[PDB]
Amino acid sequence: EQMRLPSADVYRFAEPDSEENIIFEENMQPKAGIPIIKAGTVIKLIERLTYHMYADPNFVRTFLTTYRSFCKPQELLSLIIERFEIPEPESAELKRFRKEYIQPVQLRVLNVCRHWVEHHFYDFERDAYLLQRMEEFIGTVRGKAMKKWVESITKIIQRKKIAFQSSPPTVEWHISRPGHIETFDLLTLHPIEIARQLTLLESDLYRAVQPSELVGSVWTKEDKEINSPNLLKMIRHTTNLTLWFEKCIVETENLEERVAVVSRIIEILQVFQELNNFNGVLEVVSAMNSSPVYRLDHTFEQIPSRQKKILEEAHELSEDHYKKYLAKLRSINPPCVPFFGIYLTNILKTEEGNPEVLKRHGKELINFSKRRKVAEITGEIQQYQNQPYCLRVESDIKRFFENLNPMGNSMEKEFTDYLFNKSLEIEPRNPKPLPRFPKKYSYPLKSPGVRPSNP
Amino acid sequence: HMTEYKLVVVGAGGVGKSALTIQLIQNHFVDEYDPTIEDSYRKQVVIDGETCLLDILDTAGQEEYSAMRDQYMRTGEGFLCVFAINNTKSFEDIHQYREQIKRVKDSDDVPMVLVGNKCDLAARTVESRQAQDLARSYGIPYIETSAKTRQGVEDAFYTLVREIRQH
Ligand SMILES: *[C@H]1C(=O)N(CC)C(=O)[C@@H]1c1cccc(CN)c1
């Protein structure tokens, strides 16, 4: 039966639904049968975030991930404190309202606070007054059903303020021996271990990126260094490794030794493919398709066809706007290291290609579908961050790659031009004859292969 | 089979370059873009009577993956070199983007277009004349566009298709 709620003059969240304040999508919430909100006013979004009829975890999860584009943390807290503070209407009516409206609504604002403090604690780390107000509000909360949730929120706050498999494969070694960090290089370390240790770094770098660094396309704006530092460390490592692979190639002036270098890198690619490190796969593909490397026809001619074919299928992952990459990522199960670039573009273009507001009968409504669409991409990013790799860290090999600096003190253009001028030197532009260059490696060039040495 | 033109958008990040392609692909009265679907980067168009398909690659948001530019650029037959009229650094970055394209395609004559985008109501720092002068020095067209109104968007892309066709 229809329930009597207070007037909008005293309580804003009692205003009835209309085309001017809340609209929905045609379909219904997957797994739950709940309407999908397309757009609404902030008051209507807060009402639905703390709805009395039912709990809406997906909307809560979406809201708290993307609300900062349309509402400030300080403003949201005020709104949820306003929501909680329910005045009784101006008996059968009052007893049912207390059990069917006040208790469910007050209980749902406490779930929001809990989810906020647990999953988006950064809002409180960056605004101590926001945490004073949250802790203050939570102190005023009294009741039988509340004590349980009020104590859980307090136990999360103090924890946040304080601050598992079988045996992994044996570490593989080639010419360089354990501890002899001074000899470590592309051809001296084992190609399986280079690919494993790079996959561990790249997996940790991938896992460290949070949605606070992605929502609002903040990695593309002036404060990107402040707001997206883990994403940027991650992209920079990737860029470093691509440039290192190119440097290794073009600074190996002897053709036979250079053929050994390109082959070894394709072996590192083959192991990245095995390990589902698509970041790694594309680091190698990007180095191979770079202007200095691509043009080395005398080098690729002498590469075995098995390795050419391996490189060819890895290249095709990037073709037709990452069609095969996308399909292959959906077909595999973790652990994996996705290529982040696609996610970055999709979030940017979603946010730049859709309006912040929709207008119905002259009134402005927040476009929540735009926000949901972004939370879907960040959710997919997080689904691949749960699973770790069952591979042992080799601390010296790890540190070797962490400390690579192929550019040195040079700027991008300087270094890029040097790599290209080395490419033209080692293999001149036709019809200039192919010169010969002395060998630079005292050790053997033959690979140990990509198949483990022991069981 | 109708002709397919592989077009690549290159330009500075942080200055709303994505609007150029988004506005082309989305219908002039629709503002509901999903970058996930295939139709989001493919468009069947009629230019000078000859019907064709435009495939547009815009890696907007991947600027920090600087070592992937060569790869991305080699995909294209024609390039839209995009700067924002409200940001002089994005205009100053065009010279190196062009040099990089020439190197990737191993050619001094690559079908290319210079696009000046008006992304917001912020003040203009790049006078049309400066950009008109830069374009003439490279021997390519110059098209200005507005992200708010969709003005110039179609001319930018169509002008590039004609640069490819007349190559
Ligand atoms: C475009 C631009 O040149 N700048 C920097 C001065 C902006 O901030 C403008 C911009 C950037 C990103 C998206 C949008 C769309 N409103 C606009």
Task: Give the total residue count for chain B.
Answer: 167
**Contacts A205 to B, Cβ<8 Å:** none
Give the count of domains, chain A: 2
Domains and CATH numbers, chain B: 1-167 (3.40.50.300)
The span from the CA of B103 to the CA of B118, in Å, is: 29
Same domain flag for A361 and A307: no
Whether residue B21 has its Cβ less than 6 Å from ligand 1:
no
Q: Give the count of alpha carbons within 13 A of A453, CB side only.
A: 12
∠ CA B103-B108-B112, rounded to 5°: 90
CB atoms < 10 A from the CB of A380, how many? Answer: 13
Is the CB–ligand 1 distance for residue A225 below 6 Å?
no
Burial degree of A396 (CB within 10 A; 0-12, 13-18, 19+): middle
Tokens of A170: 């044996």
Residues paired with B45 in a beta bridge? B52
Residues A181, A281 within the same domain: yes
Beta bridge partners of A359: A364
* A281 neighbors A313 (Cβ within 8 angstroms): no
> Are A83 and A180 in the same domain?
no
| Burial (Cβ within 10 Å: 0-12, 13-18, ≥19) of residue A409 | exposed
* CA proximity to A20, closest of A4, A36, A43: A43
Token pair of B101 as six digits: 């394209």
- Of A50, A83, A82, nearest in space to A64 by CA: A50
Distance of residue A165 Cα from the nearest chain B Cα, in angstroms: 34
Backbone angles phi, psi at A340, to 5 degrees: -75, -25
**φ, ψ of residue A447 in degrees (nearest 5):** -80, 145
Q: Rounded distance, CA A125 to CA A160, Å?
A: 9
B68 Cβ neighbours under 8 A, 6+ residues apart: A242, A282, A286, A341, B59, B62
Q: Are residues A215 and A82 part of one domain?
A: no
The three-class DSSP label of residue A362 is coil
**What span, in angstroms and rounded, lies between the C-alpha atoms of A36 and A49?**
12
Q: Is A377 exposed, middle or buried (0-12, 13-18, 19+ CB in 10 A)?
A: buried
PDB experimental method: X-ray
3-state secondary structure A273-333: HHHCEHHHHHHHHHHHCCHHHHCCHHHHHCCCHHHHHHHHHHHHHHHHHHHHHHHHHHHCC
Amino acid identity of B135?
A
The residue out of A364, A383, A402 marking a domain boundary is A383
Tokens encoding A277 = 């490190």
Q: How far apart (Å, rounded) are the C-alpha atoms in residues B124 and B145?
A: 13
Q: Which of A367, A383, A399 is the last residue of a domain?
A: A383
Distance B147 CA to ligand 1 centre (A): 10
**Claim to verify: residue A243 and residue A294 sit in the same structural domain:** yes
Q: Does the CB atom of residue B119 touch ligand 1 within 6 A?
A: yes
Q: Do A146 and A33 belong together in one domain? A: yes
| Token pair listed for B38 | 């295939």
Question: A183: Cβ–Cβ under 8 A, 6 or more apart, which residues?
Answer: A175, A176, A177
Closest partner CB to B67 (pick from A217, A239, A350): A239
A207 and A277 belong to one structural domain? yes
**Cβ–Cβ below 8 Å for B60 and A352:** yes
Q: How far apart are CA B143 and CA B114, in angstroms?
A: 6
* Domain ranges, residue A438: 169-340+384-453
Q: Tell me, yes or no, whether A330 and A345 share the same domain.
A: no
Residue B13: closest CA among B61, B65, B71, B75: B61
Question: What was the resolution (in A) of this experimentally determined structure?
Answer: 2.7
Whole-angstrom Cα Rg for chain A: 28
C-alpha to C-alpha distances, A75 to A43, A126, A384, nearest whole angstrom = 11, 15, 33
| Contact residues, B window 108-167, toward A, CB-based 8 Å cutoff | none
From residue A136, give the alpha-carbon distance in Å to each of A71, A126, A132. 21, 17, 6
What contacts A389, CB < 8 A, 6 or more positions away? A199, A200, A203, A275, A335
Q: What are phi and psi of A376, to 5 degrees?
A: -65, -40
| Exposure string for A255-268, b = 16+ CB within 10 A, e = fewer | bebbbbbbbbbbbb
**Cα separation, B83 vs B135, whole angstroms:** 12
For residue B92, is it left (φ>0), alpha (ψ between -120 and 50) or beta? alpha
Q: State the residue for tokens 């294209």.
A: B76
Residues pairing with B80 in the sheet? B9, B113
Pinpoint the alpha helices (H) of A3-56: 42-49
Considering the domain architecture, whether residues A144 and A224 belong to the same structural domain is answered as no
- Tell me, what CATH number does A315's domain have? 1.10.840.10
Chain A neighbors of B96, CB-CB under 8 A = 413
* Whether residue A328 is found in the same domain as residue A268: yes
Do A326 and A418 share a domain, yes or no? yes
CA distance linking residue A444 with residue A199, whole number of Å = 26
Amino acid at residue number A13: F
Residue A326: list chain B partners with CB under 8 A.
Answer: none
Q: Which residues contact A97 (CB under 8 A, 6 or more apart)?
A: A3, A4, A5, A88, A89
Backbone angles phi, psi at B10, to 5 degrees: -125, 145
**Nearest neighbour of A349 by CB, restricted to B35, B65, B103:** B35
Strands B50-58 and B78-84: unpaired
What is the bridge-based pairing of β-strands B50-58 and B42-47?
Answer: antiparallel
A72 and A195, same domain (yes or no): no
Closest listed residue to residue A38, CA positions, set A366, A350, A362: A366
Closest alpha carbon to A106 in A149, A76, A158: A149
